[PDB]
Design a protein around this ligand. Structure first.
Ligand code: HEC
Ligand code: HEC
Length: 187
């Protein structure tokens, strides 16, 4: 029922300036959206438009999406969810070996579970549907700076999610910077 063609024009005329027309943003401030899951894109946009998601730089996006209809946001969500994801590159000096170990096997000493167990072996996440009561957003190729910022919001409680708040608070700045670096290069 969602109209991907209309979603295309919305992304082209509204979102592209920050997130790119395919969702593969080139500015580390604007998170990637290509192949992010439909319900996740939809609810995050609505939250930013409606003043519920306030942390970080959400304030620059809210005015631009203020007069988008709910159907408009659903259409551009379905559009972005079908795009092909591009990845950044892992910085060899940002301990990508530790990042990979956090991602694939967690940090058992600090009860940090492997990110991959929810976010997938390529960081594709999991969409909602079926009898699944819990979906997981895509992370692969996401800008490392954005990842660290969200992880900090979860740490401080500026962003709410009991699962991620508990995970982020068990980790160190070094842990976050490493796993973020690895995630940027996940293709
Ligand atoms: C520049 C003024 C932007 C415009 C135009 C659009 N977005 Fe945006 N968006 C922008 C920023 C700076 C951020 C991050 C805020 C933060 O927490 O620091 C976002 C975030 C999103 C997200 C969440 C992504 C995620 O959680 O991984 C989504 C789903 C999103 N934005 C959607 C979106 C849409 C659909 C847009 C066109 C209608 C759009 N944004 C435009 C900045 C800007
Ligand atoms: C299942 C128990 C999970 C584990 C293991 C990890 N994450 Fe997760 N993540 C999970 C959920 C249910 C959500 C969405 C919550 C919400 O606020 O909507 C997330 C989200 C994130 C994000 C934000 C993504 C964004 O686009 O803004 C990040 C940066 C993230 N998760 C990182 C992350 C890392 C680094 C993990 C391994 C240490 C990890 N997650 C594990 C569920 C689960």
């Amino acid at each position: 029922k969602a109209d991907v063609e209309k979603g295309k024009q919305v992304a082209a005329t509204v979102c592209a300036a920050c997130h790119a027309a395919d969702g593969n943003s080139g500015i580390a401030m604007y998170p990637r959206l290509a192949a992010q899951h439909t319900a996740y894109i939809y609810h995050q946009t609505i939250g930013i438009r409606d003043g519920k998601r306030t942390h970080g730089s959400a304030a620059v996006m809210k005015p631009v999406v203020m007069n988008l209809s709910d159907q408009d946001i659903l259409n551009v969500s379905a559009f972005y969810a079908k795009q092909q994801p591009k990845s950044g590159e892992a910085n060899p000096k940002e301990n990508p070996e530790l990042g990979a170990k956090i991602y694939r096997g967690g940090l058992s000493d600090k009860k940090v579970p492997a990110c991959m167990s929810c976010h997938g072996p390529s960081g594709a996440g999991m969409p909602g549907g079926g009898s699944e009561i819990q979906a997981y957003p895509r992370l692969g190729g996401q800008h490392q700076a954005y990842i660290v910022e969200q992880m900090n919001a979860y740490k401080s409680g500026q962003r709410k999610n009991t699962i991620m708040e508990d995970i982020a608070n068990r980790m160190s700045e070094e842990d976050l910077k490493a796993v973020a670096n690895f995630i940027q290069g996940l293709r």
